[PDB]
Amino acid sequence: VDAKIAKLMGEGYAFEEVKRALEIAQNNVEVARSILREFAFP
């Protein structure tokens, strides 16, 4: 998870949205990324 959080924050996403997307995604990074793309606000 720590590598996955770092990957996604390195891509510009914020800490709390990253952790929650990973939770919903059951730690699938590709799925978490798709969640962030579709649903992050702004």
From Swiss-Prot:
After translation, the protein is modified as follows: Phosphorylated on tyrosine and serine residues upon TCR or BCR activation, and upon various types of cell stimulation. Auto-ubiquitinated upon EGF-mediated cell activation or upon T-cell costimulation by CD28; which promotes proteasomal degradation.
What is the reported tissue distribution? Expressed in placenta, heart, lung, kidney, spleen, ovary and testis, as well as fetal brain and liver and hematopoietic cell lines, but not in adult brain, liver, pancreas, salivary gland, or skeletal muscle. Present in lymphocytes (at protein level).
Q: What name does UniProt use for this protein? A: E3 ubiquitin-protein ligase CBL-B
One further remark on this entry is:
This protein has one functional calcium-binding site.
**Induction statement:** By serum starvation.
Per UniProt, residues of the UBA domain are: 1-39
- What are the boundaries of the signal sequence? none
Q: Where in the cell is it found?
A: Cytoplasm
Resulting phenotype, L36A: No effect on interaction with ubiquitinated proteins
Role description: E3 ubiquitin-protein ligase which accepts ubiquitin from specific E2 ubiquitin-conjugating enzymes, and transfers it to substrates, generally promoting their degradation by the proteasome. Negatively regulates TCR (T-cell receptor), BCR (B-cell receptor) and FCER1 (high affinity immunoglobulin epsilon receptor) signal transduction pathways. In naive T-cells, inhibits VAV1 activation upon TCR engagement and imposes a requirement for CD28 costimulation for proliferation and IL-2 production.
Q: Which residues of the full protein are shown?
A: 932 to 973 of 982
How this chain assembles, per its entry, is: Interacts with SH3 domain-containing proteins LCK, CRK and SORBS1. Interacts with LCP2 and ZAP70. Interacts with CBL. Interacts with SH3 domain-containing proteins VAV1, FYN, FGR, PLCG1, GRB2, CRKL, PIK3R1 and SH3KBP1/CIN85. Identified in heterotrimeric complexes with SH3KBP1/CIN85, CD2AP and ARHGEF7, where one CBLB peptide binds two copies of the other protein. Interacts with poly-ubiquitinated proteins. Dimerization is required for the binding of poly-ubiquitin, but not for the binding of mono-ubiquitin. Interacts with EGFR (phosphorylated). Interacts with IFT20.
Disease / disorder: Autoimmune disease, multisystem, infantile-onset, 3: An autosomal recessive disorder characterized by autoimmune manifestations apparent in the first months or years of life. Clinical features may include hypothyroidism, type 1 diabetes mellitus, systemic inflammatory manifestations such as fever and hepatomegaly, and autoimmune cytopenias.
Please report any disulfide bonds recorded for this protein chain, giving both cysteine positions: none
Outcome of M9A?
A: Loss of ubiquitin binding. Reduced levels of tyrosine phosphorylation
How are the domains described in the entry?
Answer: The N-terminus is composed of the phosphotyrosine binding (PTB) domain, a short linker region and the RING-type zinc finger. The PTB domain, which is also called TKB (tyrosine kinase binding) domain, is composed of three different subdomains: a four-helix bundle (4H), a calcium-binding EF hand and a divergent SH2 domain.
